[PDB]
Design a protein around this motif. Structure first.
Motif: not given
Ligand SMILES: [Cl-]
Lengths: 459, 445
Positions: A198-202, A430-432
């Motif tokens: 559920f992270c943008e980078g992943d 929190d991914c960031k």
């Molecule tokens: Cl990310």
């Protein structure tokens, strides 16, 4: 004498038979009676699908047509599965859903993987498991959504899990990381590395992989809205944010003729003459077999305090039918007794009906659909059976809170925040900042569920 | 027509017994009309009752006669046995009163005035609680000194002040002398009769000279006895009537046709039994009462709605029908709903269920069951009878049409009073025959 022209059975593509444009016309009627008949038994939904959603669904069908199972693009994409890495962009990307867990979980999680496909320009393929093709019609005009039975990896599906060398969370843990395929463990027992899905980078990494295999028993839609990029697209697809499962579930899930005969015969025999129908979806999480008096009190208290059912006097009306689903007949029997034995305080006529007590999955599906046909619905806390039914019907339910210590809760129920299902096992990350966070308190439209406080839902 | 073609008197207080007249909105009109002679008999009964009933001067004076040629004669019915038996045997004693110019008084038992309204305009039918022999009712049996059989035995047979008539199913040849003409002439002088019975003894009254001529005038259609007297005597109280109307309204009132299936299984095991389930599907299908279901994918080309009203102590038979009509389409396209009011307010519900079954268009009943006899008779329904199984085997044929709507008399005498010797009383006249369901019973046809 060519007169389609001057008298075409021309169809408003936004007709209520096509659920306002959600459905395509042109399916064979006979082979899936339920598809266009939902209109004879249900009222039109007040929630209208956005033009953006409609165009997204029409265009998914184009993609599914070009890349679907048995096409030449599909057969060519399959050849990438032969090597561990790929030499350039295939024309088609896929997400395969493994049939896993109970019927409620499978409907909701399949709706979630389909949204995900829409957000990532992938084609959805469905592992039919033991029964998917006995329960549900084809939802994509012109193609099959079923995974071919000779898909090379199907015999690995059961054993895929967290330590599989293809598990994306495994690779992230053991700091190993284009791949031909990737397995995403999204079952409720998944861990911190699995949750990196559920992270943008992943998602940027995962976006490159042509084949994704998903195992999931969760309605994970909510956490998709907290992903940059997905958020802007979701916002456009669903102007009314808590209509995701109402639209995608109605679009994807149409009972086969065998199941639909269970719905229509039950409705026509028992429900069709009422002026109003109340659904009471009862699920009691407890090893002991019921029925429990505190649950019966909860039901009486809830339906009377919310004015769903009248009180009775122990000392030209409207006819209200009560549809009770439950493993144990005792709750329905008790309601049935009460309204036989004493007149209603209001003069209303009350009939109580329960289909079944403990073809099993076909009856379960029929009973979800019957509940979805009611005017007002009471659900059980934590029950995905209820989530399906409330979502298909566009019903904001009254929720019977989970009792503790077998005491009737006070209040016994209260109104849901929205008609959306609950995501039971969300990530709290929190991914960031790379740190823990309360994902229920980031944005107004993603809240903690009324009934399971760890979970998240769209409001 | 609220008055059922003159059977009922106008003038009762409606609100105190809603069923009395308001039940015309729940049944079809009966095709059976009471003879003019019966109607007169009932109006004149009501006169006799007003004149001699409890609380009158004539009653008080007749009471005095028990302390040891007056103008009031009575017959007192003791509340005894289950509800079905009580309704039938009470109707039987009422007929006996009509035939012997007596006043009928009803021992109210635990519940009779909770179940039934007053049947006789402007008087009560209940025996006063201070009637002096009430404390003896329980003990009265074939060994009471005032038992008629006990007198025929000891040969103890002035005019007696009172007599006890043992007509329970366990009675003997001396008790059974009640059904002879000469014994009736003796009994006819006694001012007070007390009866304990659990049987519908009407058919044997038709075999007694003198009663025979009167019965022929009262019932030119001979098999309407219980249908007329039962609808005249039995009116559910407002409590019970609410069980009827609520259930009818919630579950039965939209059907085009209603089928009653009255299930009683005489067994130790509570069941349910697959041989009984098989008997029921087979009976209703072979008789075109309910449609077949089928397993064809290709379906043929509005539908009638039939509601199936099932009564039984066990829910399994209705559950089996309900499942089958849920799981499979009907061969006819008909819409089938299956409804069962209760499974194991007990007697209130029993009476309401009998009353609901009497509301159907066609009725299946269980062999031997007086519960079903009451339902069919009140409804004017000639039933299909599910024969009693043996050795847990589905009977074949599973059921047959009854000869008539009348109840069956389970314990008839088998005795020729004149030749003073035994005889088969089911072979004397064409209108009194052996019952379909219990081969030594008698019923009117
Ligand atoms: Cl990310």
């Amino acid at each position: 004498v060519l007169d389609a022209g001057v008298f075409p059975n021309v169809t408003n593509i936004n007709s209520d038979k096509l659920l306002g444009g959600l459905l395509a016309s042109g399916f064979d009627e006979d082979s899936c009676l339920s598809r266009y008949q939902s209109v004879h038994y249900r009222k039109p939904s007040p929630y209208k699908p956005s033009s953006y959603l409609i165009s997204k669904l029409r265009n998914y069908e184009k993609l599914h047509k070009r890349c679907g199972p048995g096409t030449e693009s599909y057969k060519k994409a399959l050849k990438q599965l032969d090597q561990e890495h790929i030499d350039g962009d295939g024309e088609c990307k896929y997400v395969v859903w493994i049939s896993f867990s109970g019927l409620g979980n499978r409907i909701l999680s399949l709706a979630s993987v389909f949204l995900y496909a829409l957000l990532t320009d992938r084609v959805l393929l469905v592992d039919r498991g033991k029964d998917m093709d006995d329960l549900f019609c084809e939802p994509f005009l012109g193609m099959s959504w079923l995974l071919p039975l000779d898909f090379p990896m199907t015999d690995q599906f059961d054993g895929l899990n967290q330590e599989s060398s293809r598990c994306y969370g495994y690779m992230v843990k053991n700091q190993v990381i284009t791949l031909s395929h990737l397995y995403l463990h999204l079952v409720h027992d998944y861990g911190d590395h699995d949750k990196m899905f559920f992270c943008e980078g992943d998602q940027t990494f995962i976006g490159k992989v042509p084949w994704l295999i998903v195992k999931t028993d969760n309605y994970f839609v909510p956490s998709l809205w907290l992903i940059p990029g997905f958020d802007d697209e979701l916002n456009k697809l669903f102007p009314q944010k808590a209509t995701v499962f109402h639209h995608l579930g109605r679009y994807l899930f149409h009972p086969t003729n065998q199941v639909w005969g269970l719905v229509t015969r039950y409705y026509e025999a028992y429900l069709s003459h009422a002026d109003e129908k109340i659904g009471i979806q009862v699920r009691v999480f407890d090893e002991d077999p019921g029925p429990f008096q505190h649950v019966m009190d909860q039901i009486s208290s809830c339906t009377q305090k919310e004015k769903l059912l009248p009180e009775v006097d122990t000392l030209t009306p409207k006819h209200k039918a009560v549809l009770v689903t439950s493993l144990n007949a005792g709750y329905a029997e008790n309601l049935k007794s009460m309204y036989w034995e004493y007149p209603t305080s209001t003069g209303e006529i009350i009939g109580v009906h329960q289909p079944s007590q403990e073809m099993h999955n076909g009856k379960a599906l029929a009973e979800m659909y019957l509940l979805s046909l009611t005017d007002n619905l009471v659900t059980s806390a934590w029950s995905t059976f209820g989530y399906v039914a409330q979502g298909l019907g566009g019903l904001k339910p009254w929720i019977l809170y989970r009792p503790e210590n077998r005491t009737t809760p006070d209040p016994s129920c209260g109104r849901a925040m929205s008609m959306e299902p609950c995501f039971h096992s969300p990530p709290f990350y929190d991914c960031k900042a790379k740190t823990g966070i309360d994902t229920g308190t980031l944005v107004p439209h993603v809240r903690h569920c009324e009934d399971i406080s760890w979970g998240l839902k769209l409001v």
